[PDB]
Amino acid sequence: DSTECSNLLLQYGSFCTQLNRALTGIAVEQDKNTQEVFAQVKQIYKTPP
Amino acid sequence: TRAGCLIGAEHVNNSYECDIPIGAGICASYQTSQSIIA
Ligand SMILES: *[C@@H]1O[C@H](CO)[C@@H](O)[C@H](O)[C@H]1NC(C)=O
């Protein structure tokens, strides 16, 4: 909540941008992990009685 | 959605294989004029 933010951003928010890119890659990477471990076969057969 | 509120795309009831990971069971694609669908 600092009253100057644009100067702070243009001087040091690019490191945070790169690290946020790293976290976004990790997040999409975890989603792809869940997809490849649970969706090996994409066929839905209903449970028989 | 459970992930958040989405503005700017048209929701469709039918489902396809998705390439843009949104989250909370929702995905995005650009095919339908032509507009982004969720
Ligand atoms: C999608 O489902 C909702 C469920 O209420 C319905 O109101 C809507 O008309 C449906 N749209 C299409 C294109 O089937």
Label each residue of chain A as H, E or C. Answer: CCCCCHHHHHHHHHHHHHHHHHHHHHHHHHHHHHHHHHCCCCCCCCCCC
Residues 7-36 of B with CB under 8 A from A: 17, 21, 23
| Sole residue written with tokens 């992990």 | A33
Three-class SS state of B19: coil
DSSP annotation of B10 reads B
What resolution, expressed in A, was reported for this entry? 3.4
Q: Among all chains, which residue has been given the structure tokens 């028989």? A: A48
What approach was used to elucidate this structure? Answer: cryo-EM
Q: How far is the CA of A23 from the centre of ligand 1 (A)?
A: 36
In whole angstroms, how far apart are CA B29 and each of A16, A23, A38, A44? Answer: 28, 23, 22, 23
**Cα–Cα distance between B3 and B20 in angstroms, integer?**
14
- Report CA torsion sign: B12, A31, B20, A41: negative
Distance CA A30, CA A24 (A): 10
